[PDB]
Structure 1
């Protein structure tokens, strides 16, 4: 399906993923158009941070679902 990722600047980017793709795959798609290392990426869904190893099916993420991206520090 197609998902949405909102940034803390108020902007949102459209991303194409199936409900079986891994989280690190989603981050690499973000870097693919935003140039942000999947290392620094924090993906939050419904007020909960996601895990790279898991998939979208674990968090029952459907279409038009908005994920929130935040940067790490050190």
Structure 2
């Protein structure tokens, strides 16, 4: 199952993922592909930030959905 992830600079990432995968799970897959550390990722969909505990189906994320990736900005 391919999902879409849109970053702050408007850059999209395609990701193979299974509905049972946790949010920690998906963040870990983002680190693999794009070198973004999980602790620095904010995963936002439908108007709410996802939480590590829940799976993809607990926010009803399915098939061609596009989640937002917001970097935790510190400096």
TM-score normalised per structure 2 = 0.92
Structure in which a larger fraction of residues adopt helix: 2
What per-residue deviation string (whole Å, max 9, x for no partner) do you get for residues 29-64 of structure 1? 101011111011100001210001110110111111
Contact 2:21 2:55 in 1 (8 A): yes
**Residues 1:3 and 2:39 are matched in the alignment:** no
The gaps in structure 1 that reach 5 residues or longer are none
Write out the 4+ residue segments of structure 1 that deviate beyond 3 Å after TM superposition. none
Secondary structure, in 3 states, of the residue corresponding to 1:13?
A: strand
Q: How many residues align?
A: 74
State the Cα RMSD in Å. 1.0
- Cα deviation for residue 72 of structure 1 reads 1.3
Residue deviations 1:7-34 (CA, integer Å, cap 9, x gap): 1111101001111100011001101011
C-alpha displacement of 1:66: 0.3
**Following TM superposition, by how much is the alpha carbon of 1:73 offset from its aligned partner in structure 2, in angstroms?**
3.5
